[PDB]
PDB file of C-alpha atoms in Angstrom:
ATOM      1  CA  UNK A 324      15.773 -30.833   5.073  1.00 23.60           C
ATOM      2  CA  UNK A 325      18.740 -30.626   7.257  1.00 21.14           C
ATOM      3  CA  UNK A 326      19.950 -33.198   4.875  1.00 18.19           C
ATOM      4  CA  UNK A 327      21.228 -30.014   3.564  1.00 18.91           C
ATOM      5  CA  UNK A 328      23.161 -32.205   1.128  1.00 16.82           C
ATOM      6  CA  UNK A 329      19.696 -31.771  -0.146  1.00 16.58           C
ATOM      7  CA  UNK A 330      19.297 -33.524  -3.408  1.00 16.17           C
ATOM      8  CA  UNK A 331      17.830 -31.875  -6.580  1.00 17.37           C
ATOM      9  CA  UNK A 332      15.287 -34.440  -7.432  1.00 14.48           C
ATOM     10  CA  UNK A 333      13.587 -34.692  -4.291  1.00 13.69           C
ATOM     11  CA  UNK A 334      12.494 -31.191  -4.439  1.00 14.70           C
ATOM     12  CA  UNK A 335      11.238 -31.989  -7.778  1.00 12.59           C
ATOM     13  CA  UNK A 336       9.006 -34.869  -6.712  1.00 13.38           C
ATOM     14  CA  UNK A 337       6.943 -32.535  -4.778  1.00 12.47           C
ATOM     15  CA  UNK A 338       4.729 -31.485  -7.592  1.00 12.13           C
ATOM     16  CA  UNK A 339       3.504 -34.910  -7.966  1.00 10.99           C
ATOM     17  CA  UNK A 340       2.625 -35.032  -4.530  1.00 13.67           C
ATOM     18  CA  UNK A 341       1.258 -31.659  -4.881  1.00 17.57           C
ATOM     19  CA  UNK A 342      -1.108 -32.694  -7.441  1.00 15.40           C
ATOM     20  CA  UNK A 343      -2.975 -34.526  -4.826  1.00 17.37           C
ATOM     21  CA  UNK A 344      -3.713 -31.235  -3.143  1.00 18.61           C
ATOM     22  CA  UNK A 345      -6.394 -30.531  -5.656  1.00 19.91           C
ATOM     23  CA  UNK A 346      -8.302 -32.699  -3.466  1.00 20.58           C
ATOM     24  CA  UNK A 347      -8.215 -29.873  -1.101  1.00 23.69           C
ATOM     25  CA  UNK A 348      -7.873 -29.276   2.599  1.00 24.01           C
ATOM     26  CA  UNK A 349      -6.278 -25.884   2.700  1.00 23.95           C
ATOM     27  CA  UNK A 350      -4.724 -26.243   5.916  1.00 25.07           C
ATOM     28  CA  UNK A 351      -2.781 -29.146   4.666  1.00 26.94           C
ATOM     29  CA  UNK A 352      -2.233 -27.322   1.438  1.00 25.99           C
ATOM     30  CA  UNK A 353      -0.970 -24.388   3.246  1.00 28.98           C
ATOM     31  CA  UNK A 354       1.569 -26.442   5.025  1.00 26.00           C
ATOM     32  CA  UNK A 355       2.610 -27.557   1.675  1.00 26.57           C
ATOM     33  CA  UNK A 356       3.116 -24.185   0.237  1.00 28.22           C
ATOM     34  CA  UNK A 357       5.526 -23.096   2.737  1.00 28.81           C
ATOM     35  CA  UNK A 358       7.205 -26.318   2.410  1.00 28.36           C
ATOM     36  CA  UNK A 359       7.215 -26.188  -1.228  1.00 29.81           C
ATOM     37  CA  UNK A 360       8.744 -22.820  -1.607  1.00 28.69           C
ATOM     38  CA  UNK A 361      11.895 -23.733  -0.086  1.00 31.45           C
ATOM     39  CA  UNK A 362      13.488 -25.960  -2.493  1.00 32.91           C
ATOM     40  CA  UNK A 363      13.600 -23.835  -5.405  1.00 36.33           C
ATOM     41  CA  UNK A 364      16.869 -22.283  -6.261  1.00 40.13           C
ATOM     42  CA  UNK A 365      14.757 -20.319  -8.725  1.00 39.09           C
ATOM     43  CA  UNK A 366      14.572 -23.420 -10.900  1.00 37.57           C
ATOM     44  CA  UNK A 367      12.586 -26.633 -11.011  1.00 39.81           C
ATOM     45  CA  UNK A 368      10.652 -23.614 -11.248  1.00 39.27           C
ATOM     46  CA  UNK A 369       9.240 -23.351 -14.603  1.00 38.23           C
ATOM     47  CA  UNK A 370       7.713 -26.570 -14.890  1.00 39.64           C
ATOM     48  CA  UNK A 371       6.306 -25.677 -11.774  1.00 40.02           C
ATOM     49  CA  UNK A 372       5.316 -22.238 -12.777  1.00 36.70           C
ATOM     50  CA  UNK A 373       3.541 -23.633 -15.498  1.00 37.21           C
ATOM     51  CA  UNK A 374       2.009 -25.858 -13.195  1.00 38.14           C
ATOM     52  CA  UNK A 375       1.162 -22.953 -11.132  1.00 37.83           C
ATOM     53  CA  UNK A 376      -0.480 -21.508 -13.950  1.00 37.73           C
ATOM     54  CA  UNK A 377      -2.254 -24.690 -14.252  1.00 38.91           C
ATOM     55  CA  UNK A 378      -3.210 -24.173 -10.796  1.00 37.47           C
ATOM     56  CA  UNK A 379      -4.282 -20.890 -11.707  1.00 36.04           C
ATOM     57  CA  UNK A 380      -6.550 -22.114 -14.255  1.00 35.06           C
ATOM     58  CA  UNK A 381      -7.741 -24.603 -11.964  1.00 35.16           C
ATOM     59  CA  UNK A 382      -8.225 -21.917  -9.498  1.00 35.04           C
ATOM     60  CA  UNK A 383     -10.512 -20.171 -11.835  1.00 37.59           C
ATOM     61  CA  UNK A 384     -12.762 -23.135 -12.541  1.00 40.06           C
ATOM     62  CA  UNK A 385     -16.161 -22.010 -11.218  1.00 38.05           C
ATOM     63  CA  UNK A 386     -15.094 -21.926  -7.704  1.00 39.34           C
ATOM     64  CA  UNK A 387     -16.827 -21.328  -4.496  1.00 37.71           C
ATOM     65  CA  UNK A 388     -13.661 -20.489  -2.600  1.00 37.27           C
ATOM     66  CA  UNK A 389     -13.811 -20.506   1.042  1.00 36.74           C
ATOM     67  CA  UNK A 390     -10.573 -22.192   1.916  1.00 34.88           C
ATOM     68  CA  UNK A 391      -8.749 -21.985  -1.217  1.00 28.73           C
ATOM     69  CA  UNK A 392      -8.951 -18.348  -1.199  1.00 32.05           C
ATOM     70  CA  UNK A 393      -6.659 -18.334   1.639  1.00 29.71           C
ATOM     71  CA  UNK A 394      -4.405 -20.500  -0.187  1.00 26.10           C
ATOM     72  CA  UNK A 395      -4.281 -18.063  -2.907  1.00 25.34           C
ATOM     73  CA  UNK A 396      -3.052 -15.381  -0.734  1.00 26.74           C
ATOM     74  CA  UNK A 397      -0.518 -17.606   0.665  1.00 24.30           C
ATOM     75  CA  UNK A 398       0.496 -18.821  -2.602  1.00 23.59           C
ATOM     76  CA  UNK A 399       1.154 -15.460  -3.659  1.00 23.79           C
ATOM     77  CA  UNK A 400       3.371 -14.976  -0.774  1.00 23.57           C
ATOM     78  CA  UNK A 401       5.179 -18.064  -1.430  1.00 24.76           C
ATOM     79  CA  UNK A 402       5.382 -16.968  -4.896  1.00 23.61           C
ATOM     80  CA  UNK A 403       6.446 -13.581  -4.045  1.00 23.18           C
ATOM     81  CA  UNK A 404       9.556 -14.679  -2.476  1.00 20.56           C
ATOM     82  CA  UNK A 405      10.810 -16.542  -5.363  1.00 23.00           C
ATOM     83  CA  UNK A 406      10.612 -13.796  -7.695  1.00 20.99           C
ATOM     84  CA  UNK A 407      12.640 -11.671  -5.466  1.00 21.51           C
ATOM     85  CA  UNK A 408      15.361 -13.987  -6.050  1.00 21.25           C
ATOM     86  CA  UNK A 409      14.534 -14.733  -9.472  1.00 23.48           C
ATOM     87  CA  UNK A 410      14.235 -13.284 -12.714  1.00 22.40           C
ATOM     88  CA  UNK A 411      10.770 -14.132 -13.523  1.00 23.81           C
ATOM     89  CA  UNK A 412       8.635 -13.844 -16.574  1.00 21.25           C
ATOM     90  CA  UNK A 413       5.349 -13.871 -18.415  1.00 22.28           C
ATOM     91  CA  UNK A 414       3.761 -15.910 -15.778  1.00 18.57           C
ATOM     92  CA  UNK A 415       3.813 -12.805 -13.760  1.00 17.68           C
ATOM     93  CA  UNK A 416       2.100 -10.785 -16.329  1.00 19.08           C
ATOM     94  CA  UNK A 417      -0.639 -13.117 -15.908  1.00 18.83           C
ATOM     95  CA  UNK A 418      -1.049 -12.277 -12.275  1.00 18.91           C
ATOM     96  CA  UNK A 419      -1.463  -8.862 -13.298  1.00 22.42           C
ATOM     97  CA  UNK A 420      -4.224  -9.887 -15.485  1.00 22.18           C
ATOM     98  CA  UNK A 421      -5.563 -12.191 -12.942  1.00 22.84           C
ATOM     99  CA  UNK A 422      -5.632  -9.572 -10.392  1.00 23.31           C
ATOM    100  CA  UNK A 423      -7.736  -7.431 -12.720  1.00 24.68           C
ATOM    101  CA  UNK A 424     -10.370 -10.110 -12.770  1.00 22.92           C
ATOM    102  CA  UNK A 425     -10.617 -10.436  -9.030  1.00 23.59           C
ATOM    103  CA  UNK A 426     -12.681  -8.353  -6.569  1.00 26.94           C
ATOM    104  CA  UNK A 427     -11.472  -8.089  -2.898  1.00 28.98           C
ATOM    105  CA  UNK A 428      -8.985  -5.808  -1.051  1.00 30.23           C
ATOM    106  CA  UNK A 429      -6.403  -8.163   0.297  1.00 30.65           C
ATOM    107  CA  UNK A 430      -5.184  -8.796  -3.233  1.00 30.72           C
ATOM    108  CA  UNK A 431      -5.082  -5.100  -3.935  1.00 29.08           C
ATOM    109  CA  UNK A 432      -2.978  -4.904  -0.879  1.00 29.58           C
ATOM    110  CA  UNK A 433      -0.674  -7.453  -2.319  1.00 29.42           C
ATOM    111  CA  UNK A 434      -0.702  -5.643  -5.514  1.00 30.44           C
ATOM    112  CA  UNK A 435       0.057  -2.568  -3.876  1.00 31.81           C
ATOM    113  CA  UNK A 436       2.724  -4.406  -2.114  1.00 32.40           C
ATOM    114  CA  UNK A 437       3.890  -5.088  -5.497  1.00 36.38           C
ATOM    115  CA  UNK A 438       3.511  -1.422  -6.267  1.00 36.83           C
ATOM    116  CA  UNK A 439       5.949  -0.729  -3.679  1.00 36.88           C
ATOM    117  CA  UNK A 440       8.241  -3.264  -4.571  1.00 30.76           C
ATOM    118  CA  UNK A 441       8.321  -2.820  -8.148  1.00 36.24           C
ATOM    119  CA  UNK A 442       8.882   0.785  -7.505  1.00 36.35           C
ATOM    120  CA  UNK A 443      12.075  -0.346  -5.933  1.00 36.28           C
ATOM    121  CA  UNK A 444      12.857  -3.000  -8.501  1.00 34.72           C
ATOM    122  CA  UNK A 445      12.774  -1.161 -11.768  1.00 32.09           C
ATOM    123  CA  UNK A 446      14.383  -2.865 -14.637  1.00 30.53           C
ATOM    124  CA  UNK A 447      11.218  -1.459 -15.977  1.00 30.71           C
ATOM    125  CA  UNK A 448      10.335  -2.811 -19.217  1.00 28.32           C
ATOM    126  CA  UNK A 449       7.602  -5.020 -18.225  1.00 31.41           C
ATOM    127  CA  UNK A 450       6.057  -2.372 -16.212  1.00 33.69           C
ATOM    128  CA  UNK A 451       5.318  -0.336 -19.135  1.00 31.13           C
ATOM    129  CA  UNK A 452       3.447  -3.058 -20.829  1.00 31.00           C
ATOM    130  CA  UNK A 453       1.750  -3.756 -17.771  1.00 28.55           C
ATOM    131  CA  UNK A 454       1.014  -0.158 -17.325  1.00 26.49           C
ATOM    132  CA  UNK A 455      -0.611  -0.492 -20.618  1.00 29.25           C
ATOM    133  CA  UNK A 456      -2.350  -3.571 -19.472  1.00 26.78           C
ATOM    134  CA  UNK A 457      -3.416  -1.773 -16.583  1.00 30.64           C
ATOM    135  CA  UNK A 458      -4.562   0.978 -18.738  1.00 30.03           C
ATOM    136  CA  UNK A 459      -6.907  -1.343 -20.221  1.00 35.71           C
ATOM    137  CA  UNK A 460      -7.774  -2.835 -16.901  1.00 37.39           C
ATOM    138  CA  UNK A 461      -8.417   0.431 -15.628  1.00 39.74           C
ATOM    139  CA  UNK A 462     -10.447   1.657 -18.487  1.00 42.78           C
ATOM    140  CA  UNK A 463     -12.183  -1.600 -18.193  1.00 43.13           C
ATOM    141  CA  UNK A 464     -13.027  -1.009 -14.490  1.00 47.50           C
ATOM    142  CA  UNK A 465     -14.207   1.301 -11.513  1.00 49.91           C
ATOM    143  CA  UNK A 466     -14.007   0.952  -7.621  1.00 49.99           C
ATOM    144  CA  UNK A 467     -12.415   2.495  -4.668  1.00 48.24           C
ATOM    145  CA  UNK A 468      -9.582   0.211  -5.058  1.00 46.92           C
ATOM    146  CA  UNK A 469      -9.005   1.239  -8.494  1.00 45.98           C
ATOM    147  CA  UNK A 470      -9.592   4.742  -7.538  1.00 44.36           C
ATOM    148  CA  UNK A 471      -6.838   4.430  -5.097  1.00 44.15           C
ATOM    149  CA  UNK A 472      -4.795   2.677  -7.692  1.00 46.49           C
ATOM    150  CA  UNK A 473      -4.957   5.498  -9.989  1.00 44.95           C
ATOM    151  CA  UNK A 474      -3.628   7.674  -7.406  1.00 44.57           C
ATOM    152  CA  UNK A 475      -0.400   6.032  -6.953  1.00 46.06           C
ATOM    153  CA  UNK A 476       0.116   5.237 -10.503  1.00 46.54           C
ATOM    154  CA  UNK A 477      -0.659   8.753 -11.368  1.00 43.46           C
ATOM    155  CA  UNK A 478       1.814   9.647  -8.879  1.00 41.69           C
ATOM    156  CA  UNK A 479       4.254   7.435 -10.590  1.00 43.25           C
ATOM    157  CA  UNK A 480       3.970   8.729 -14.201  1.00 42.66           C
ATOM    158  CA  UNK A 481       6.444   8.704 -17.229  1.00 39.69           C
ATOM    159  CA  UNK A 482       5.952   8.911 -21.058  1.00 40.22           C
ATOM    160  CA  UNK A 483       3.453   8.667 -23.919  1.00 43.75           C
ATOM    161  CA  UNK A 484       3.581  12.296 -22.943  1.00 42.35           C
TER     162      UNK A 484
ATOM    163  CA  UNK B 438     -14.411  19.502  26.995  1.00 41.08           C
ATOM    164  CA  UNK B 439     -14.917  19.350  23.264  1.00 42.41           C
ATOM    165  CA  UNK B 440     -11.600  17.869  22.566  1.00 41.50           C
ATOM    166  CA  UNK B 441     -11.819  15.311  25.165  1.00 38.78           C
ATOM    167  CA  UNK B 442     -15.275  14.240  24.763  1.00 37.76           C
ATOM    168  CA  UNK B 443     -15.345  14.264  21.100  1.00 40.67           C
ATOM    169  CA  UNK B 444     -12.587  11.911  21.598  1.00 41.63           C
ATOM    170  CA  UNK B 445     -14.934   9.282  22.995  1.00 43.89           C
ATOM    171  CA  UNK B 446     -18.047  10.839  21.620  1.00 45.90           C
ATOM    172  CA  UNK B 447     -16.800  10.024  18.129  1.00 45.94           C
ATOM    173  CA  UNK B 448     -18.320  10.811  14.670  1.00 42.73           C
ATOM    174  CA  UNK B 449     -15.910  11.666  12.046  1.00 44.62           C
ATOM    175  CA  UNK B 450     -18.328  14.079  10.469  1.00 45.78           C
ATOM    176  CA  UNK B 451     -18.202  16.547  13.322  1.00 48.85           C
ATOM    177  CA  UNK B 452     -14.532  16.584  13.094  1.00 46.68           C
ATOM    178  CA  UNK B 453     -14.765  17.796   9.557  1.00 46.85           C
ATOM    179  CA  UNK B 454     -16.673  20.775  10.477  1.00 48.90           C
ATOM    180  CA  UNK B 455     -14.799  21.673  13.551  1.00 45.50           C
ATOM    181  CA  UNK B 456     -11.526  21.082  11.809  1.00 46.74           C
ATOM    182  CA  UNK B 457     -12.328  23.530   9.202  1.00 46.21           C
ATOM    183  CA  UNK B 458     -13.086  26.173  11.851  1.00 47.04           C
ATOM    184  CA  UNK B 459     -10.208  25.347  14.009  1.00 46.51           C
ATOM    185  CA  UNK B 460      -8.176  25.537  10.891  1.00 45.26           C
ATOM    186  CA  UNK B 461      -8.566  29.184  10.818  1.00 42.07           C
ATOM    187  CA  UNK B 462      -8.280  29.931  14.484  1.00 42.41           C
ATOM    188  CA  UNK B 463      -5.007  28.664  15.887  1.00 40.93           C
ATOM    189  CA  UNK B 464      -2.467  30.983  17.703  1.00 37.57           C
ATOM    190  CA  UNK B 465      -4.731  33.900  18.262  1.00 40.43           C
ATOM    191  CA  UNK B 466      -5.842  31.708  21.132  1.00 39.40           C
ATOM    192  CA  UNK B 467      -2.646  30.349  22.492  1.00 39.43           C
ATOM    193  CA  UNK B 468      -2.171  27.481  24.985  1.00 36.97           C
ATOM    194  CA  UNK B 469       0.230  25.865  22.640  1.00 38.30           C
ATOM    195  CA  UNK B 470       1.279  22.719  24.365  1.00 38.90           C
ATOM    196  CA  UNK B 471      -2.208  21.696  24.983  1.00 39.19           C
ATOM    197  CA  UNK B 472      -3.397  22.583  21.651  1.00 40.28           C
ATOM    198  CA  UNK B 473      -0.541  20.584  20.121  1.00 42.11           C
ATOM    199  CA  UNK B 474      -1.245  17.954  22.561  1.00 42.09           C
ATOM    200  CA  UNK B 475      -4.704  17.750  21.185  1.00 42.66           C
ATOM    201  CA  UNK B 476      -3.740  17.993  17.701  1.00 43.43           C
ATOM    202  CA  UNK B 477      -1.544  15.106  17.803  1.00 41.51           C
ATOM    203  CA  UNK B 478      -4.342  13.084  19.149  1.00 39.74           C
ATOM    204  CA  UNK B 479      -6.694  14.055  16.474  1.00 37.91           C
ATOM    205  CA  UNK B 480      -4.370  12.827  13.971  1.00 37.43           C
ATOM    206  CA  UNK B 481      -3.715   9.753  16.148  1.00 34.67           C
ATOM    207  CA  UNK B 482      -6.793   8.245  14.750  1.00 36.15           C
ATOM    208  CA  UNK B 483      -6.504   6.397  11.603  1.00 31.91           C
ATOM    209  CA  UNK B 484      -7.789   7.742   8.489  1.00 36.10           C
ATOM    210  CA  UNK B 485      -5.469   9.315   6.231  1.00 36.46           C
ATOM    211  CA  UNK B 486      -8.258  11.696   6.230  1.00 39.24           C
ATOM    212  CA  UNK B 487      -8.385  12.262  10.017  1.00 36.15           C
ATOM    213  CA  UNK B 488      -4.772  12.663  10.077  1.00 35.53           C
ATOM    214  CA  UNK B 489      -4.843  15.129   7.241  1.00 34.73           C
ATOM    215  CA  UNK B 490      -6.932  17.781   8.956  1.00 36.64           C
ATOM    216  CA  UNK B 491      -4.396  18.473  11.668  1.00 36.46           C
ATOM    217  CA  UNK B 492      -1.942  19.453   8.981  1.00 34.95           C
ATOM    218  CA  UNK B 493      -4.393  21.634   7.095  1.00 36.24           C
ATOM    219  CA  UNK B 494      -5.639  23.546  10.157  1.00 37.96           C
ATOM    220  CA  UNK B 495      -2.099  24.046  10.956  1.00 35.49           C
ATOM    221  CA  UNK B 496      -1.359  26.111   7.912  1.00 36.19           C
ATOM    222  CA  UNK B 497      -3.104  29.160   9.221  1.00 39.46           C
ATOM    223  CA  UNK B 498      -1.607  28.362  12.532  1.00 39.93           C
ATOM    224  CA  UNK B 499       1.925  27.590  11.585  1.00 40.02           C
ATOM    225  CA  UNK B 500       2.172  30.624   9.605  1.00 45.54           C
ATOM    226  CA  UNK B 501       1.183  32.669  12.564  1.00 42.64           C
ATOM    227  CA  UNK B 502       3.169  30.725  15.092  1.00 40.72           C
ATOM    228  CA  UNK B 503       2.510  31.216  18.756  1.00 38.73           C
ATOM    229  CA  UNK B 504       4.126  31.555  22.263  1.00 36.74           C
ATOM    230  CA  UNK B 505       6.997  29.352  21.075  1.00 39.73           C
ATOM    231  CA  UNK B 506       6.300  28.156  17.530  1.00 36.18           C
ATOM    232  CA  UNK B 507       8.367  29.265  14.546  1.00 35.12           C
ATOM    233  CA  UNK B 508      11.637  27.439  15.235  1.00 34.00           C
ATOM    234  CA  UNK B 509      10.041  24.441  16.355  1.00 33.73           C
ATOM    235  CA  UNK B 510       7.324  24.759  13.755  1.00 32.53           C
ATOM    236  CA  UNK B 511      10.090  24.210  11.397  1.00 29.30           C
ATOM    237  CA  UNK B 512      11.381  21.294  13.505  1.00 31.88           C
ATOM    238  CA  UNK B 513       8.012  19.492  13.825  1.00 35.81           C
ATOM    239  CA  UNK B 514       7.057  18.674  10.285  1.00 35.26           C
ATOM    240  CA  UNK B 515      10.307  16.819  10.286  1.00 38.17           C
ATOM    241  CA  UNK B 516       9.657  15.022  13.532  1.00 37.66           C
ATOM    242  CA  UNK B 517       6.322  13.785  12.492  1.00 38.42           C
ATOM    243  CA  UNK B 518       6.397  12.140   9.063  1.00 40.04           C
ATOM    244  CA  UNK B 519       4.523   9.291   7.262  1.00 38.08           C
ATOM    245  CA  UNK B 520       4.516   6.724   4.604  1.00 35.38           C
ATOM    246  CA  UNK B 521       1.564   4.757   3.469  1.00 35.22           C
ATOM    247  CA  UNK B 522       1.937   5.927  -0.046  1.00 32.23           C
ATOM    248  CA  UNK B 523      -0.697   8.431  -0.595  1.00 30.72           C
ATOM    249  CA  UNK B 524      -0.598   8.981   3.043  1.00 30.98           C
ATOM    250  CA  UNK B 525       3.160   8.905   2.355  1.00 31.50           C
ATOM    251  CA  UNK B 526       2.558  11.320  -0.335  1.00 33.96           C
ATOM    252  CA  UNK B 527       0.563  13.577   1.863  1.00 34.38           C
ATOM    253  CA  UNK B 528       3.564  13.961   4.157  1.00 35.51           C
ATOM    254  CA  UNK B 529       5.938  14.130   1.254  1.00 37.50           C
ATOM    255  CA  UNK B 530       3.879  16.492  -0.755  1.00 33.69           C
ATOM    256  CA  UNK B 531       3.112  18.906   1.964  1.00 36.50           C
ATOM    257  CA  UNK B 532       6.725  18.785   2.462  1.00 39.84           C
ATOM    258  CA  UNK B 533       7.289  18.864  -1.204  1.00 37.57           C
ATOM    259  CA  UNK B 534       5.077  21.857  -1.421  1.00 35.26           C
ATOM    260  CA  UNK B 535       6.963  23.185   1.473  1.00 36.29           C
ATOM    261  CA  UNK B 536      10.091  22.205  -0.379  1.00 35.34           C
ATOM    262  CA  UNK B 537       8.833  24.136  -3.303  1.00 36.45           C
ATOM    263  CA  UNK B 538       8.233  27.678  -1.564  1.00 36.76           C
ATOM    264  CA  UNK B 539      10.314  29.837   0.854  1.00 37.67           C
ATOM    265  CA  UNK B 540       8.318  28.807   3.704  1.00 37.82           C
ATOM    266  CA  UNK B 541       7.508  32.294   4.610  1.00 38.38           C
ATOM    267  CA  UNK B 542       6.259  33.004   1.139  1.00 38.13           C
ATOM    268  CA  UNK B 543       4.731  29.610   1.089  1.00 39.35           C
ATOM    269  CA  UNK B 544       2.604  30.409   3.977  1.00 37.87           C
ATOM    270  CA  UNK B 545       1.437  33.632   2.472  1.00 37.93           C
ATOM    271  CA  UNK B 546       0.178  32.311  -0.831  1.00 38.50           C
ATOM    272  CA  UNK B 547      -1.364  29.113   0.408  1.00 40.64           C
ATOM    273  CA  UNK B 548      -3.065  30.567   3.427  1.00 42.57           C
ATOM    274  CA  UNK B 549      -4.997  32.740   1.175  1.00 44.17           C
TER     275      UNK B 549
END
């Protein structure tokens, strides 16, 4: 990689390779994700993102996660980073949705992590929708996690007086 | 004995009860450093909740102050402070609450 003359393309070929991952082995996959993250100057991105979303669908599937779960968390990390740099998009909205589906803490933690972050980040607009989304999600749901969720959000508050 | 043992004799539930009681008692029985010493410990434990009691007990206490407390009482809330969002909030809020009344007044209303 310390061929820091680091050509565009090469980074790009990864996905192809990556496709192969669907024949799992997380551990390998995991190595990939880290590896993967790196190349992206917040670009070859979309095609990827899309692909990620594909992954995401794929991730849904019917699953009996045991290994891939892990991956997900990781992915999200990997993913997280990018965003920091980037301006990101709808894809993201989808996580929010996605997250609603889900049922385990670690994600909530991420989410929360996001809570924090976003709290810092504020360009805002999205949030509001999402807040709406959430409103649904929320209405649509119960749990400690949620319960907790409410608290912060509540804490947060703005309009629709 | 209670303090120590309970610490390493566990059960959160006990703590609730005792907390509540202790909550009232404070500086009428002095021994500040120790008592502080304890109090810190009680908090030490995780649980936003476990942590929380030491502050609440404190309100009757703080207000009264003891063999050294008012100046310092003021200093302490500052020295000990926390994030963890709603745990953050607890610190912030108590503060914020604190922020909101002349602390002398503050003590009077809340206490009752």
